[model samples]
Target: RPTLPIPDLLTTDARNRIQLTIGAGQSTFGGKTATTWGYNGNLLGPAVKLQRGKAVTVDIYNQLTEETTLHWHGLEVPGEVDGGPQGIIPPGGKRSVTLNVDQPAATCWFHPHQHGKTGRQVAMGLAGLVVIEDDEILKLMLPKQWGIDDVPVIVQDKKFSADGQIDYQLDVMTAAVGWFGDTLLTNGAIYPQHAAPRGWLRLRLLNGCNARSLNFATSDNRPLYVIASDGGLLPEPVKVSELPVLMGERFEVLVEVNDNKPFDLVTLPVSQMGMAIAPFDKPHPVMRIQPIAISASGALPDTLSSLPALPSLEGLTVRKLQLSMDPMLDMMGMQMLMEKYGDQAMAGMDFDFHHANKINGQAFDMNKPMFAAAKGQYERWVISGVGDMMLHPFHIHGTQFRILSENGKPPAAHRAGWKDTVKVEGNVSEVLVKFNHDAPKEHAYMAHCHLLEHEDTGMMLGFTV
Candidate 1:
């Protein structure tokens, strides 16, 4: 394999803001030209870096034929500008939003969150990275150079037709069983390879795949030190040979490069749907690293960063949310609704092809608010999935949460930090959540499964805080 080029960093405008254009173009990946959408490029967009405590604005222009929304995943911005379903950008239009970076340094991202079309738009390569920095992280003796020792790795699976064109079709069963692709693409390159110095390398891994989860590991059995999770840095590096990464999840891991032989970063088979369905049964290489003669830099610290203590559950409102696949009950309810209001009443109803994989026994309702909370108030949410047959990666918008327990047991050490997404693997997941941002009843926020197809089809709910 050839060495792949890293994503370039974006330069700030005169006003110290990032100007992004969401447009469509043709990109040739794996020697095949395919139509794709991206920000400021033909494929995946540029990586934008921002400093903590600074205010930044992004100018987003939509040049496509249809409407789309630019959602800043894992960003804590104003509810109106968070780019939920309500924040739609029409064709040939532009929208801008300013955000005060008050959160800790983390590896966040931006992507299209347009309703129903999110699955296809993102699958066609509409995503970028938003990296936040702080003095604490900058003072550490880690690799500071961009696109070199510290690199971004966006892993996604895609399918192509025999004619060498991207085939991004979500079939009928895709609503219930999320779409899984046959080939994996890392950083927009097929079987990507990178040349690195013989030292500690930081890999910012993002599981951009539509549905499949990964068990990431090294081919030569080296321990991968996990330094950070979705929201920010962990308390300390957790050494693990293999790590389970679900959809929409992010991790920053440190790996020592081999001096004599190159090693491949690979993902073993992981069945997110439990034993009922095993889609990925083979190990696949994401990227291979070739060690260069450049001198090594920095030593791995014992402590990365300290996180705040978990919020106490006392005096907080407890809400029980259940996720299930209730097709029979959903059909009965839809029949009642059709009987009451006739066929025309169901015109705009996105019943997800009458399939029923939902949370709290309800599908997505844009007009209705499923729950409500006051800003700055703490809340305990007990989220559970139905059975071992299916697993859901629960993700919340507007704010991040800490996992208090999973199936009444304390979460693993790696899950101790703040996170916006959690994998509910055949069991109930519990978290202590607090909303520091306001989500009004008019606009609202969303919580849903991160499986892109499931989210597109209505395994989600809306709330206002």
Candidate 2:
């Protein structure tokens, strides 16, 4: 593969209202032109910067022949404006949503959430990064330069056809495990390289892959500073040599680079037999960082930010959910059980995938109600993985939760923060959560595997508050 160029970025705007147009275009990948979808005119869309406390309206247009919807991942907007499946934009139609932007500073993203087609659409190219800026985060000394010290690294995996076109064909294992592509793409480019200055730099790393869990590490096992997780900046930075990043998970890291030679950010291969593909079979380079210049300032802060006291978990209602998987034919037994009992037998079930992707023995049903919670109700959710050597990245929309434990142990140092997603790796994980906002009974929120293919196939459930 040739050197990768930085993805185009959307210029900052002075207007409170912005227009986003979604359309199709031909993009050259590996010197071959392939039909792809993008927010503007490129493979991957540009980054969106939103201001805190400032109410803004985003006008979006859908020019594709088919319907699509934009779900603002990690934004705490209302359910209707939350861009769930209920907010679908018809072909050649237009819609606008205004947001209060009343959340902590974080790195969010926007991608198509058209039910049953999210994985394909996203894989074909239709995702963009959103950086929320607050006065507090801006006050802290950090890299502010674009395409330089501060950079967005959106890591995704993709497979290509013999003719050089990106392929989206699904196989049995693919639908079961989520699409793990043969080629790894960083910001829509394969084998990308960036020339930067020698010194400490900041990186907004996003595991944009549909299914693969990323084991991010340096080539020489040098420690890197993990300054932030999914929600925002951590109370303080934690130094680590390896970081396990799952689908839809994001981490902000600070590292010092040498000017003498280049360094590579690669995903260390996992040795689990459950994985039999590229990202797990071979370590792939996310991006090659070559220090070419020097810049002053942007040193790591001793103290980053403070958080309000976490809500207590005393006397809260405990809910139970199990993550499970088997061959697609295993559903025969479940179907028999459902018939032996009644429709009520499936009640309270989380989700089910016909191809071995499931939650609580059920697949996703947009019409069926799984559960409900009242606003301001604090509770605990226990999620466990069942099956031989199974791991899943469980994601919940609409709210961020505080992790209580992983496999009966306290969360690691890097995971001791607010999060919207957690990895359930061959064990049980628990989280304390509260529905702070209201969601309509009709247009519900979702909780499921962050693996895009599993999510699309059925490993998800819908609930309302």
Candidate 3:
């Protein structure tokens, strides 16, 4: 892949921590100044690498002139410290939290988590990888050399001007469907090229795009092995032709590089290929994978990681859910009520199909309570979409879940695992979830679709302890 956008990070000393100032800034990567915001400066913050069980403290100082919250994606901690949006770090204010994580080892990340503007803020550059190491991750026969071997590849596409700067405000079409760009970036480098060594190469890819869902594979239909999914390693390596990962989702793909061959790490839209949806169609390359044409090392090991058996579900309570969207119920209904006072109602806009895009029967209610549960409960919830709505990727904070069934049967073999986020296949996705940490007192966790614009407008929601 293009050289990584950012480098691996070093944590702060004990009794001392890095105070991240969230504010506006400016940078010109290809000789063009782009108005932007970041945790430190420029585009995206530095990756934070922490040892397992270590106590890490981050004091977030909001200097952005606007309110912004941070969420520790894929990291395990109490809700408040997890940086859920409810713990809003007020403008000109601060938020202090300490993390003592004891969860499975994996590659996690961080980003702003404001209620309605997360998509834009993140799009403007406010993301970084967080690696929490453990004996398990260390023992796996996977890529290891940080900046060299195994790497965090953040995939995002952007459109630039004649002068070369990013602008994401949006035209009517983009606003309704979020935004899109033509230049794909790894780390923060656009159209980067990378040299790969022979043997097994581990790629931890995060679909950091605002609205794009990636269908990734080699130009050839060779099977790519899957070592891990969102939460962590699968029981063993999974060989598949292509995989579809949506926004706010992550996947670890293992490829056995022929000692002397070269390939492209690519991403394409189904619409462009007459397979996905339209206009959004267009085949494009995202990352590159160079391989040795032929040489020494043998093929990749069949076994990847010895993932612990999924936690027993012998005895757990089942909580069901029905999620949907209703531009009609959300906007026109409001429009009918406040006829004279009608303003720009989101549902009234031509974004997603009014009733065609939603969760349950309601869209996201930023301020209203989405769901609430008691601490230490085994909650099995059924989340379903409605009408002709596209399948949404459902994600929950503070806990990982398992899909009990796909449409109405057991989940596909490839999707049965501990997943904090999973895609709704059609009009429905049933996930059995459980929460052990405190969310109410600490700070409420969130449960929402990953589509940022949908999230920003009203397709997202939150849950409480």
* Candidate with the greatest lDDT versus the true structure: 1
> For model 2, where is the 10-residue window of minimal lDDT?
344-353
Number of clashes in every candidate structure?
0, 4, 31
Encode model 2's per-residue lDDT on 365-426: one tens digit a residue.
88875888657777899988756344478887777777888766888988888788887867
Candidates in descending TM-score order: 1, 2, 3
365-402 per-residue lDDT for model 3 (tens digits): 54656667767656667776554334466788777666
| lDDT of candidate model 3 versus the reference | 0.65
> TM-score, each model?
0.91, 0.90, 0.83
TM-score computed on alpha carbons, candidate 2: 0.90
Clashing residue pairs for model 1: none
Model 1 lDDT per residue over 93-176, tens place: 989888788888999988888877778889888989888888898877877667778899998887788877777765444555
lDDT of each: 0.78, 0.76, 0.65
Compare candidates 1 and 3 on lDDT and give the better one.
Answer: 1
- Quantify how close model 1 is to the true structure by its C-alpha RMSD in Å: 6.7
State which candidate, 1 or 2, has the greater TM-score: 1
Where does candidate 3 stray beyond 4 Å?
16-23, 27-31, 91-93, 160-165, 170-176, 271-282, 291-301, 304-316, 327-368, 407-412
CA lDDT of 295 in candidate 1? 68
